[PDB]
Each structure stands twice: as C-alpha cells, then as structure tokens.
Design a protein around this ligand. Structure first.
Ligand SMILES: *c1cc(=O)[nH]c(=O)n1[C@@H]1O[C@H](COP(=O)(O)O)[C@@H](O)[C@H]1O
Ligand SMILES: *c1cc(=O)[nH]c(=O)n1[C@@H]1O[C@H](COP(=O)(O)O)[C@@H](O)[C@H]1O
Lengths: 215, 215
C-alpha cells in the first residue's frame, strides 16, 4: 500500500468523505470503506470512490453471519466494485470459507480479522485469536487484520501467519496505537479519525508518513 | 410477534422481496431485513417495507465492530426506520453498550446474538455463549437471539436470561431446526429460505403456523 497507510473513511456524508479522501490522495493508494459511509450513502459510493480516486477499496464489513448469508454479502460487495472484504473469523471456518469461495469466483480478496483493537476484544476474542489465525492459515487465507493497540498480540499473530502473509492493523491514533511500533509487525496501518477529524487531513496524513519513512 | 413467526427476507432484489413479503403478510407482523437485501437495494428499503406492510422491522446487521463504529451503524439504521437491530455479543461489553446507548437515545431496541446456528458456531462462539448471555443480562439487555439448531443450548440460554426476556431464534427449516421444539424455549422463530424459496411462500408460512398453533 502506498506509504503503508490505509485511510479508514468513516465520515457519513458523501461530500465530506469525498473532500477528505481527495485531500489525502497523494499520500495513499488504498481506502477502507465501511458501513458508516455505505449505509448512509449507498453501495454505489464504492464504485464512485474507486473511479474518482483510482484507489484500491477494502470493504470493511466485518462479515459475521452464517455461510449462506456471508456468500450473499460478499457477492454484493464485489459486484459493487470492492477489491477486498474484511471478514470475522470468530464465527468459524465454514463462514470464512464461504467468503473465500466467492472471492475466488470473482477474482478478489478476503482479509481475516483475528483480534480486534478495542478494549472489549479482551473479553472473548483475544482468547480465541491465536486459534482464529491458525484456522486462517489452514484455510489458505493470506490477508489478515490484527490490533495496533496490542503490539505483543500483533507480534504473536505475525508469528502464526508467517512473513509472506499480508497484515493490516487498525487502532492507530485515536485508539492509542503508534504507527512506527505497529509497522514493526504489520505491513500497513489503518488510520481513520486521526486523519478525517483533523483540521487539516493532508497535514495529518503527511505527519504520519514522515514518522514512518524514518523506519 | 404475530403467530410467533418472523420472516427473514434475504432475497436480493426489491421486486421479489416485495412480492414474497406481501404474499405472507397475513401470517406475520415482523420482518427481519439484513445485508443481502439492504446492500442490493439500499437502506431506503427498510422504510418502504415498514410503510407498505405496516410491519415491525428488525435490521439483522450482526453488528460486530468497535464502539464508535457500532454507534454510527446503529444511528444510521434507526434513522432508516428500523425498530430494532441485532448485535453480536462476542466483541465484548463496550461494543454492545454503544448499541444500547443509541437505542436508548432513539427509542429503539437491541437484540443480542449469543450463539449462532450454523456448524462453525461450535468452534469459538459456543464456548463463550453462556458468558455472552450473562454479559447481556448484566448490561440490561432484554432481547436475545439463540440457535434453533441446538435446543439444548437454547434451553441453557433461556435459563440465563430468564422468562421475562424476549428470545428469537433462527435456523428453523433450511438449517434443520424444528418450529415446535424451538418454541419450547424461544418466543418467536425466524424463518427465511423455507418460506422465501418455496414454490408457494404463503402455503409454506401457513404450514409452519399450523404446527405452531397446535402447540
Ligand atoms: C475494525 C476492527 C478492529 O479491530 N478495530 C477497528 O478500529 N476497526 C475499524 O477500523 C477503523 C479504525 O479507525 P480509527 O480508530 O482510526 O478512527 C474503523 O473503521 C473501525 O470500525
Ligand atoms: C443469523 C445468526 C444465526 O445464528 N443464524 C442465522 O441464520 N442468522 C440469519 O438468520 C436467517 C436464517 O434464515 P434461513 O436459514 O431460515 O434461511 C438469515 O438471515 C441468517 O443470515
């Protein structure tokens, strides 16, 4: 990813989302779009962004349903133009395999979310996260998501998935995570609020990048 | 709910979804709409359904994000007219509380999904489900979702949440669950494919009700 930085575009109205993404485009090549924006402006916003910015789009839908419904969600998401979709591994292997089958059919990618970055992740997800990561490896998953807020857990996740797997990580900035430390284990960092709520989003992105390039 | 039956309307195009829902309307008073229909036709479909059928609408979005994003998803969903939203409990208590706070602000309801109905639920969710249900009780959750495919687990969930809590249950029909046995513990059953893929959806719904009324 350009500059190893992925923008989490979670503003909820089209005009502000387009403005901020355009302001930081020279510093990124990948935008993560989720439900806050899609449920407010429609799935057509994915194709609009992909075209307008010529960026790769990751649909962060944290898919967490039964196999049959996960297939339908993945199919609609790829039909809308997304390059990849983020899927929860907590619901099990069949649910993840349903997503992988659709990505294979459509020439796209699945990112497996192992451990989440917020405090509540410690209650149930953290204890199952190493096993969720191993399950991903056993299913042939090559793209993963792990927590910036717990670099020791990000390290253990990297250990399980190997150096060849691609690992992205949210929780940088607003949630407390550090760009440099996170990039010791992740290939790219996801940043949302630290950039999109900034008085000058481009300056915020530029500052993050400067603290990175020094790695 | 009318006849203790909730329709899971997971068809992906508006015309077929409207046709089937209209054909079975005399047998239900609540429609569960999820991402297969919303991501294909837009969030406006919720208000259209609520108005056209005068039914209560549960948005089955299996919300599974961090607190801040969960708040945004719930706000967009209630703004769209949904009466309730289904939320995963596995991300932890703060993620669930974020949904409860928005529901309180907007005069709506949250349903907490404890254990899922598909096979993969046995891998990680089942082992945490009793605790997820207890967490719900501690947070003051009054509406829950549990699996028709495992009535012994549905019984244990009912035991934890008490008789005053409202419990709905998917996995009836296509996934193997039985209407009557599930209703021994759940207040209402959720049915999707057994009705919407039937040659005559009204006859399928009527047949299910026949079993129910006999209880
Ligand atoms: C998903 C999973 C996870 O573990 N942590 C997260 O924060 N997310 C999503 O990533 C974005 C973080 O953005 P920000 O905290 O930098 O504003 C956001 O889209 C969240 O839903
Ligand atoms: C959600 C959670 C769960 O544990 N099980 C489920 O099946 N779901 C959703 O409920 C519907 C079941 O429909 P059907 O199997 O009768 O067709 C569906 O919307 C699924 O996503």
């Amino acid at each position: 990813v350009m500059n190893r930085l992925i923008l989490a575009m979670d503003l909820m109205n089209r005009d502000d989302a387009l403005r901020v993404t355009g302001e930081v485009r020279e510093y990124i090549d990948t935008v993560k779009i989720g439900y806050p924006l899609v449920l407010s402006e429609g799935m057509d916003i994915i194709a609009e962004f992909r075209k307008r910015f010529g960026c790769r789009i990751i649909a962060d839908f944290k898919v967490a349903d039964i196999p049959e419904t996960n297939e339908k969600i993945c199919r609609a998401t790829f039909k809308a133009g997304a390059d990849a979709i983020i899927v929860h591994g907590f619901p099990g292997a069949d649910s993840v395999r349903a997503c992988l089958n659709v990505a294979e059919e459509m020439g796209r990618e699945v990112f497996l979310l192992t451990e989440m970055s917020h405090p509540g992740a410690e209650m149930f997800i953290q204890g199952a996260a190493d096993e969720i990561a191993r399950m991903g490896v056993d299913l042939g998953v090559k793209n993963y998501v792990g927590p910036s807020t717990r670099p020791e857990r990000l390290s253990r996740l990297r250990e399980i998935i190997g150096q060849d797997s691609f690992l992205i990580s949210p929780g940088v900035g607003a949630q407390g995570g550090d760009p440099g430390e996170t990039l010791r284990f992740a290939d790219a960092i996801i940043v949302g609020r630290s950039i999109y709520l900034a008085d000058n989003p481009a300056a915020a992105a530029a500052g993050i990048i400067e603290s990175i390039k020094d790695l």
